[PDB]
Amino acid sequence: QVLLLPFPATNPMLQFGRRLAYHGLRPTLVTTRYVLSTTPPPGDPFRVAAISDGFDDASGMAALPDPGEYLRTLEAHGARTLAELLLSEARAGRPARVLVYDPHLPWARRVARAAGVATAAFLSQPCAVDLIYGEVCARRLALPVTPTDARGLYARGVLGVELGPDDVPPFVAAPELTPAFCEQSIEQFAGLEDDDDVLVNSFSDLEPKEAAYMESTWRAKTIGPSLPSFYLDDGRRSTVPCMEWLDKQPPRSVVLVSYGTVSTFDVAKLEELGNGLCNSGKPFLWVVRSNEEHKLSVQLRKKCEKRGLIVPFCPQLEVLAHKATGCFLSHCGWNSTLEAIVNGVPLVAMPHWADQPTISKYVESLWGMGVRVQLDKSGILQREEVERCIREVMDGDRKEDYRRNATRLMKKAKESMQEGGSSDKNIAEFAAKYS
Ligand SMILES: O=c1ccn([C@@H]2O[C@H](COP(=O)(O)OP(=O)(O)O)[C@@H](O)[C@H]2O)c(=O)[nH]1
Numbered sequence: 001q002v003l004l005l006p007f008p009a010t011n012p013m014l015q016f017g018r019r020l021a022y023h024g025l026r027p028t029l030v031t032t033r034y035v036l037s038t039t040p041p042p043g044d045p046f047r048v049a050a051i052s053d054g055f056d057d058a059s060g061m062a063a064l065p066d067p068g069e070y071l072r073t074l075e076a077h078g079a080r081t082l083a084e085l086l087l088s089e090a091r092a093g094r095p096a097r098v099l100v101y102d103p104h105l106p107w108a109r110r111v112a113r114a115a116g117v118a119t120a121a122f123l124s125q126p127c128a129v130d131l132i133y134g135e136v137c138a139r140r141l142a143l144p145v146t147p148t149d150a151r152g153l154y155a156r157g158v159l160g161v162e163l164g165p166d167d168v169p170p171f172v173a174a175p176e177l178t179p180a181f182c183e184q185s186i187e188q189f190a191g192l193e194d195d196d197d198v199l200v201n202s203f204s205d206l207e208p209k210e211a212a213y214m215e216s217t218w219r220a221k222t223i224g225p226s227l228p229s230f231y232l233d234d235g236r237r238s239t240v241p242c243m244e245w246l247d248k249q250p251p252r253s254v255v256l257v258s259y260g261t262v263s264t265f266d267v268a269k270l271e272e273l274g275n276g277l278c279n280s281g282k283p284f285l286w287v288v289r290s291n292e293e294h295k296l297s298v299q300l301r302k303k304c305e306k307r308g309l310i311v312p313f314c315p316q317l318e319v320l321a322h323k324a325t326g327c328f329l330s331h332c333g334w335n336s337t338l339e340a341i342v343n344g345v346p347l348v349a350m351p352h353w354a355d356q357p358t359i360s361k362y363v364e365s366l367w368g369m370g371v372r373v374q375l376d377k378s379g380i381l382q383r384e385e386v387e388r389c390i391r392e393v394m395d396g397d398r399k400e401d402y403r404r405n406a407t408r409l410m411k412k413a414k415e416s417m418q419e420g421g422s423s424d425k426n427i428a429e430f431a432a433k434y435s
Contacts, residue, residue: 001026001089001095001096001097002017002025002097002098002434003028003089003096003099004028004030004100005030005051005102007105008035012124012201012224012225013124013226014029014042015228016199016223017029017100018045018228020430022236022431023432024431025434026045026094027046027047028047028049029047030049030051030085031051032053033050033051034055034057036048036050037056049085051077051078051081051085053078054077060073067184068179071184075107078105078107079110082107086099096117097117097434098196098197099119100120100199101119102122102124103189104188109192118196118434119197120195121195121198122199122201123200123220124334126202126210126334126358127210127222128160128210128358128362129169130210131153131210131217132153132358133186133189134188134192134214135149137190143182144174145168145169145172145173146173147165147168150164150167158210160210160362160366161362161366163358164361168357168358170357171185171353171354172185178353181354193218197433198214198220199220199221199222199426200214200221201224201225201226201338203224203225203421204222204422205409205412205416206413221430222416222422224338224423225342225413227317227338227339227342228317231342231343232342232413232414233414234419236419238315238318240313240318242285242309243315243318243322247322247324251324252325253282254283255277255284255285255327256284256287256314256316256327257287258287258329258336259273259330260330260331260333260336261289263331264292265292270292270296271297271300271383272381272383272386274296274303275300275303275383276385276386277329277386278303278304279384283307285309285319286310287310287313287316288311288312289313296310316339317339317343326345326346327347327370327390327402328345328348329350329386330349332349332350332356332359332363337363340369340406341409342410342413344403344410345406346393346405346406347406348373348390349363349371349373350373350381351372360372369406370393370402371392373386373389
């Protein structure tokens, strides 16, 4: 079997597993006992299997909100139970042919290699960010990484844009705001040189210098965007109520709003975001997660409820593919960004941390498919700014420029994953290797 081990939370690794199954491989999703008991399995063509993070009954992340402590606990129990799993699978007649793993779990590679199982690292961040972390891991850049260092990489043809202070990945530019995440970002690459394969959820045409560098440096092969085949127009509709609302809207009219599944916004930040949205005048679909809703006042919720819909969950790819969708106000997490690209949807970028500031810079300055919100002197996003950016992308002099670039990259993204495409060829090479 092909074992797939994402960070326990994913869809891009599952999408790659669907393609492996197309090619006659047998994928298994590996997740925590907790997650397996408290969510539906993926279904065919996948098996599922479980490891433990120490909290099979309760959410260990809830239980352990300090990141270092959670990660140390996940390693302890995860490495032991992943070892047990590799043995029990072999004994059950289903020995792992390869472990595909998120290298935010670097212990997974140690365990597999000790069990004699091939390993395939699966990076789901852009090549531009991954390569920066790698240069630190390899002791070619010291901490903190600076704009000066980034400029060197741009001048050497490794990075395709010059990253300023607000564009360098904060986990290495300002390490220690986030010590555990700094360590985790860099340790992805520690030992990656002994993996059998290295894979990245991107496409060459998007990040050509960075992909090329990742390939020559780390053997990384692009396999993305790792999304459902339907969205990539590769021939080899839901009933969710938000969709019915979207159906009634005019073409390219609606702002989708999401800051993702992980970041938390305080009451002040939700106030500026929600007021900016109302103040724009645009219809909007604002996904505010169940676990964040308590911070949204009645007043702000009802403020413009004749134009805007607030929901706890929307099928985002289906939303992005909808004719009524005009732009996406997004934190520009990588999955969000690729889903916007594959649907040709212009972006208003409101990054927080991790890969988002870098992504945002590429969005506005190389890809040209949107704009990034400008924070004021104290680093606060103002409602006037939120509104200005929405209006810039939906009504500016440059509105067709953002749409054109989004469309352009949509087509390249599709070409990459279709038969003959740069990503398709890498996926096929992997499937053959492990067949
Ligand atoms: O209401 C939602 C919110 C999120 N997603 C999906 O969950 C992921 C969000 O990931 P991203 O890398 O952009 O940032 P994160 O959530 O990890 O910060 C993407 O696949 C989204 O399509 C969705 O379908 N509906």
